[PDB]
């Protein structure tokens, strides 16, 4: 009952340079949005750095 479809990055089609395109499968009928939204909001601000 706690067994889901554990996913994986099937490919990293890094298009050209300083640009990647990472596809992940398979997720549940609703977990693509929650992982996309979690990673999108964290990368946007939380991720630190210098400028």
């Amino acid at each position: 009952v706690t067994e889901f479809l554990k996913p994986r990055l099937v490919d990293i089609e890094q298009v050209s340079s300083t640009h990647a395109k990472v596809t992940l499968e398979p997720l549940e009928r609703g977990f693509g949005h929650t992982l996309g939204n979690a990673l999108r909001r964290i990368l946007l601000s939380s991720m630190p750095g210098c400028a």
């Binding site: 979690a38 990673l39 964290i42 939380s46 991720m47």
Partner: peptide, 12 residues
């Protein structure tokens, strides 16, 4: 993913 996993080690 490391940041989000370190923000959940007080639950699991």
């Amino acid at each position: 993913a490391t940041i989000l996993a370190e923000q959940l080690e007080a639950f699991v």
